[model samples]
Target: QNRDQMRANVINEIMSTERHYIKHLKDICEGYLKQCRKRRDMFSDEQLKVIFGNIEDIYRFQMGFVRDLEKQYNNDDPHLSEIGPCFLEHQDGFWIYSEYCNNHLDACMELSKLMKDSRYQHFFEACRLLQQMIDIAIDGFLLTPVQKICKYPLQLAELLKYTAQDHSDYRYVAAALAVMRNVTQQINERKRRLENIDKIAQWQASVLDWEGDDILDRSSELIYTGEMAWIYQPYGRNQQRVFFLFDHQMVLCKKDLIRRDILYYKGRIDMDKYEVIDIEDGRDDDFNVSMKNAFKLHNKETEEVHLFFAKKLEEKIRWLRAFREERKMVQEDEKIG
Candidate 1:
């Protein structure tokens, strides 16, 4: 009976808090809508279209993530649902909005600098305000803690605060509206600057070369090389018969040479017309005596060949020594292990 009563009390408290949070969210949305309306008249048709398109895209994408989260939550997986809805939605939405706003601001700033008109200056100011608001929104979104909540009430409360109440939230909404105002200001400034007539040719000539020749050059180069070589050996016949000297170490050479050099040599020697004797035989007919002699001759020839090739390879690799030294120096400087 006590547990039941305690549960009921907690439920009621959560319900009350949820209701308050929902009301706050509705009020914030309405406030944003009001700001939108106030700025409606300030935008030209083209600017209105661009700003609205970006806003609608952000809204639709965010709401989609929210809906996905809700579905996941209903499926009894709150964590994944929250990740999809809360984390992904906010991160993706903020980035898109920030990029869009920055692009707008940059365009306005460039135009203002070119025209040198008071109206363009106003437009630039408006864009700067929008950028500042976006920066604040990004900071708030990052700082608004969301991962610690396990229960619905705590989760909902954090979500509401992050989405609606956090740093410069109202200003972010207002700044989005201000985009239209700035665009209109820019158009007016452009017209006024055109009509001034006296400095138009001078400005046009100066702005003609705004983008320089090297601006588009953005290519890079990368080179990679292997540092070490490897060696391997093959097994001899008769597992218990020990003949260490004659056991041929198979050096992997070119593709064709691997089969021709090792396997074929084994087959020819093993089947040759000779008295096949075991190594433990007491007489000189023992395989060890023949094998030892064969290995001595093979090593005498192969050693010189190996040494010749190794020297040439070393000389070739010397070209990359400087690059290797530089790479080591950089890694040391960066304190990389």
Candidate 2:
């Protein structure tokens, strides 16, 4: 009975906070989003409708979710239909299975920056007021789901302490806790990857000798990141460059140093124009005994051979395999489409 009581208390705490959050979402979707239609000329109606609709859809789904959670809480029964692995109905059944969060945040972030534009001062002010009411930044809005998932582990663990492993009360809570822990792990991993990307993005943004347009998206996964020199680009001397390997493509960024003869290093290689994912192992090198680490990429499209040095044989093999695997998937996907 004590364990049951403690579980109920945790549910009560969650229910109370969820109710408050739902209200905030309500005000944002119904109240503030309504202003977008009223001030239609300021921003694109389609953009507002689609973007705001995404937020509202997620909000409505979450509201229904919390109500169902409340229902579960009220049951007062052991194993009241295991609530582990909750899913929300959205684009192709997203949230639980989709990483499509940045849509809402990206739109909001871009719009908020545009709000600073002198041309849309009125639009900007209204947006500021709307967000002020919501009491969170656009990024915070995106962070909301992540924070909520983190809550599950915290809340479950608190009440779980009182319940014995064999206790009925532990069934649903333990199962649900496991799900949330997986989600938290996934979210944290992505958070770390995003931070790594920001470093690359910032470097590219700097108005140094060489620069490239911001192409890094939140969805891009970093397979391997390290500094590498392009073998073909001798440029009268050995040149080192920063290399980033993402799931989509490999990026070669030029350092500020140029050939002096050419007066410029080749600018950053964007993913779109990227080619030559082909890989072959070992060209005669110093590590002849092992003959494993040094890998070469031959760009069939560009008709050029490039060398990349890796200290570990496994790292080179792993990246080489990943790039090929990703390319094959892309090709198959294109055919399927």
Candidate 3:
């Protein structure tokens, strides 16, 4: 009986929210969109298309979706509640959300550009005149498709939580959650990858006198970054260098004297050319200087040794671990090719 109440509560919540969501989308479709079209003299048809995207299609889908929920909810017996079947049937239809989400940014950009002029601002304000609708602007209505798609995954997972494992709806509920989560994942991954590529481009440009091949060309990823003391070969003064370790190479840089964000590129070591050696203790014969927690990169091609001293024991350990791992992966790839 207790499990039934818990499950019933989840179903009721889902049904009520579905109806409420449908109303909001209807307001966007009938209220704002219709009102915008009436004022076609002010706005171009292309501008209207950009501002709304495919929200009418979304509204049409959700109207049917809510009706299905209503049928299951209006059942005489609480134990007879079965919402999962509706979700399962509509799984493929949810791809409409992916298209809307991908275009959501473009829609917002188009709307905002028009809103800068007083005519567009007054027109949007007038559209919020419906007594049934909230005082939100058209842009707020435009945001619902993106927000609603994200909400479905959470609501389904919550519904899944109260559902008994052996119940008829369990598998369907779980599958629905999986599908909704995947839709959300696909949207996020594309946006995140684009941002990451932009970061790589900006970072590469920030390094002053950056020479050789473009880091973006090979999709080289930055693995580790920190300040380490570079010990000279002929006993010159030890200097702190900002080291950026990448998948393809290790770049040596100096922080610009005046502009803190800028990096002066000192040198780079290709991943395939160097062997890492962890040093225990180093004693400079000329200056009688002692250094601990150090590592050396021996260049196989030029027989050149570059010694770097870590300020802490932790830094030394992290650098050595990353170097060995990156080098091993590179060697394995080469062998496969």
Candidate 4:
């Protein structure tokens, strides 16, 4: 009886999740997009179909899955409080399960570009209404499936432990657990890759002291940025300055004190020309030599050197170490090729 109670608890918890999961999906697919169908001047129907091709199938399939749970636990009849139409029939196959796990990030990137386009601002204003309806912003909507897929592994883990090997549902639960874990790994790998790209996009788009784009290069990615505070006068120092560390290079930018971080529009350092790089000490400045917190960024190509004085010895050491680590990662990746 206790086992029965525990099983019922898991079923109850998952059914609640299923309700929530399907609700947001319906808001986007059935409610908002359906309303936009009469006039898709911005998003043509054919292109819209391509964007949502897999997810509509996901919504349909998951709605059916929830009904399967109802039949298994509630005897195919829910209470008045749980009143809703039954959806035990399926038109789509298992394709949605894998299709989304594989292609969601691609969809997220493709859709983000559309949202960023100035011409589609009007389209997105209406689209943003889905946020209020579903209580999750568009970015959250894009990531919801990724987060939901991982939840099943955790749910299955607990459910498998509750099911006894001698129990009738034991094999069924165990089989489900195995499949959940295998797919979770695949989905998780995809999520990690997409997250890295997403982060780069966010970082480059930050209100930093840079002009134009191209902060993230094909070879170099931004690994760190922070307030080094006082940049010495070139004769060098940190305030009105921000530091950016890329995989193969680092820069200390000077910006307006009003925003302090918005004027780093250009740089003189050509990353490729600075291919021969070294972080060596021995600056002649009295304060640096006395304080032991100043370092020189040496470019062997031009025999050029840049000066920076860290706010603290601790930050200086850590920032220096971070640069070395990024430098190491680039070298390792180069070796692989």
Candidate 5:
């Protein structure tokens, strides 16, 4: 009886919170989003897209989800049907959140930037007051979907805990819990990839002498980066260089000897035209391998070769692995194209 009571409490909380969540989503959709559409002069189309990324779709989807929850609640009946199947049914549709969550950071940034302008600030403030959302503004409403997508799994897990092991709903609850967890993991991984892309762009900007097109314009990955010695004079002189290996190119840079934090771009070679040749050991001038760990990058198009010396064998192997993978990837891309 106690377990059953706990299960009922969990279900009640899920139903109530979901209903409340939909109300918030509706306020953003029908309230602020609708107002934004009507007041077209306040924001441009681009700004509107940034501020509201498929949120209306999310609201509509969750509306159906809330309906399902309410139906299962059956007007507070003591006997309830399984709630887990509802999640199972909607599992595929949950990916719609992926589009919203991925671009959430941009939405917040644009919203905050626009708020700095008195016109946008007043418009949002007016909407807040008119919508009667109390303390929450448009930003607060926009945040709900991101938080809500993560909350479902937690609530479901709680519900599953109170559900009896052999109960008819137990299997469904367990399966549903797994589905929601997978959804969260997939979304989280995509978000992390996006964050890395942004980091790569920022790092590119700090490379003071980047003369070509923005790296992000076509490339999305920074496979590896490290400092190595570039042998400008094969047996005599070399420059300490920082190497940034991307999916499509290898960038050569020199660390700013003064700032110690800045990179000066030296050059880059396209992945398609570069070759990695292993140097088993350095050259022997007096029967000794002077440069212990090294490799050569031979540019097919330029017919030029560059030698780099890694401080250790593992560094050389890591660089080689990244280079080989990128080369294979580019090759496969070419074949598919």
Candidate 6:
């Protein structure tokens, strides 16, 4: 099954189902909005303001979750535990916003149907405007990743392809747009091919005589002419190997939490300082005295262990490379050719 189905079955079942519950809560908020609008004169300004405030709070929470997702994805930390809470919060916010908008729209429609004044007509217009705003926000939220990827496909691809290749010094914001333009074009092509695949498959299958002895012959020829042709050839082996090296390098980089920590520090630090500071005081001395107490309080919450690991990894890789080079030199000298 796909990621969504897997998540629903496994994670959702274990996690408290907060994601699903939040959506329903949002709907309730919308129902309240509708009830208020129906009896507008009966509700005070304070009540309306409170409802509006809650809506805004929910939206902000949703946006925050989106930002968290982007941060986690960029950092190559895809662990559900690290990011799942934010995702659930955002899902909750989205449901509330959607329900509030829907209920408000329905209330306005009802108001328009019952009223006759030109001023009441403006109320209907206001509802439409609100709907449009909500629609734009939802659409923007859904398309944000697509827009971001489309804007910097090459940079993203390069980042993924060469994970350890530091591009932190390079200006990513300007390059992202160009990358996205290229990515969008490629996505469109893929979408077109995907849309036509069923038709192409049906035509191919219809032409195949499955019961005949020639069926095996045709299948073998088709395989040889298409995918299997590359297996028989040794061309571009070096290029393929290089691609694999890059892929492995990226995977290694992703697993290096220390590297991520270093990047985070570098991004925030002033280069002019030229020195890292020990910001942690001895506040956790009591917690550290007992393992159980430390666990209860979630000890080492602020430590940049990842950065330390990354620094060690860099040193190890450098040393290993140097040792290999020295061994190669000794072997070359022994050849005496």
| lDDT of prediction 4 | 0.59
Cα error, residue 107 of model 1, in Å, equals 11
**Residue 279 lDDT (model 6):** 18
lDDT of 1 by residue, 234-276 (tens): 2223211101010111111122334432211111111111121
TM per candidate: 0.24, 0.52, 0.65, 0.49, 0.73, 0.20
Superior candidate under lDDT, 5 versus 6: 5
lDDT of 6 by residue, 1-337 (tens): 2442342333233233333333433433443355456767754666455334345455356446545644544223222323333333343334333333323433444444435666544553464354333423221232333333333334334323322223341234224334445445655544444434334334334332223232222111111000000011112121110000110011011112454322110111111112222213223242222111111111133332111111233433443343344334434535742
- Which pairs of residues collide in candidate 1? none
lDDT score for candidate 6 against the true structure:
0.32
Worst 10 residues of 3 by lDDT: 282-291
lDDT of 4 at 324: 68
Task: In angstroms, give how far residue 66 of model 2 lies from its true place.
Answer: 2.3
Candidate 6: misplaced stretches above 4 Å?
1-47, 50-53, 74-82, 88-118, 126-337
Q: List the residue pairs that clash in candidate 5.
A: none
Q: Which candidate achieves the best TM-score against the true structure?
A: 5
Better of 1 and 4 by lDDT: 4
For this target, which candidate reaches the highest lDDT against the unseen true structure? 5
Candidates sorted on lDDT, descending? 5, 3, 4, 2, 6, 1
Off by over 4 Å in 4: 8-28, 39-55, 63-150, 165-221, 226-242, 251-291, 296-308, 324-337
Predicted structure 2: lDDT? 0.55
lDDT, candidate 3, 1-337, per-residue tens? 6776777777777777777788888878887778878887876899878778788898888878878777766467665577778887887777787767766777889877887999877766766776367877777777877887888888888778788888887888898888889878877766555455558778878778978888766534567889999865646678888988876777788988888887888887776777887777867444346778877777787767667888899999888888877876666656964
For model 5, the superposed segments whose C-alpha errors exceed 4 Å read 75-79, 194-220, 232-237, 246-337
- Tens digits of per-residue lDDT, candidate 4, 71-185, equal 6665442211121112112212433566666666566676777767876656556666645564454556756666787787687777665556676566666666666677667
Q: What's model 2's lDDT at 336? A: 67
1-337 per-residue lDDT for model 2 (tens digits): 6765665566567667778777767766665577767776866876675345466666767777776666555464533323332422211233441243434455566666665777666554566575665544433444555456557678767756656577555675666666667766766655565666666666545534554444465224455556554565322244576665654555565645554322222454333344544344544532222233555555546645455566676767666776666566556646864
